[PDB]
Amino acid sequence: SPFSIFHPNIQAAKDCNQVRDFITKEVDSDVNTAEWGTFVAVSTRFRVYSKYLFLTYPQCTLEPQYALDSLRTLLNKYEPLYIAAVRELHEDGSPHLHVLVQNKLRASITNPNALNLRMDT
DNA sequence: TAATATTAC
Ligand SMILES: [Mn+2]
């Protein structure tokens, strides 16, 4: 529906490598992927406190590139280093997004709606 | 976890 607000599941990513593999798992992920930055080689009430975020926007028609661009700005204070946003389909064929964000600084997310996004149509 | 939802290492 027009001008829907999209709320993500926000998690601190436990293993960025596994998350990136997981969100690029589909054979056609290449044309459904937006990327920015350089991948960080990581060394091994609501609150998330991490440099590494794994976001899932269910039932979400946002273009990966525009989700990425807007998350870069919403997370700007934490100095994003790498973002990958990928569209996949639910079983019923409707789209959703997954995003991996790697920041320089640890983000303290206490508002669960902080990464909500509205689509411009 | 909240708070979208069946998608989420
Ligand atoms: Mn998926």
With respect to residue A3, please indicate whether it lies within any of the assigned structural domains: no
Q: How far is the CA of A23 from the centre of ligand 1 (A)?
A: 7
* Closest nucleotide relative to residue A25's CA, C1' based: B9
Domain containing residue A31 = 10-114
With respect to residue A119, please indicate whether it lies within any of the assigned structural domains: no
* Inter-CA distances, A14 with A54, A61, A76, Å: 9, 26, 22
Listed resolution, Å: 1.7
Write the CATH number for A55.
3.40.1310.20
With respect to residue A89, please indicate whether it lies within any of the assigned structural domains: yes
Question: What residues pair up with A33 in beta bridges, in sequence order?
Answer: A86
With respect to residue A62, please indicate whether it lies within any of the assigned structural domains: yes
Per the entry, the structure determination technique was X-ray
Tokens of A60: 């979400």
Q: How far is the CA of A11 from the centre of ligand 1 (A)?
A: 15
Tokens of A63: 């273009």
With respect to residue A5, please indicate whether it lies within any of the assigned structural domains: no
Backbone interruptions in chain A following residues (C to N > 2.5 Å): 44
Cα distance from N-terminal residue to C-terminal residue, chain A: 9
Number of structural domains (chain A) is: 1
Of A43, A52, A41, A34, the C-alpha closest to A104 is: A52
Round to a whole number and report the distance in Å from the CA of A84 to the C1' of B7: 17
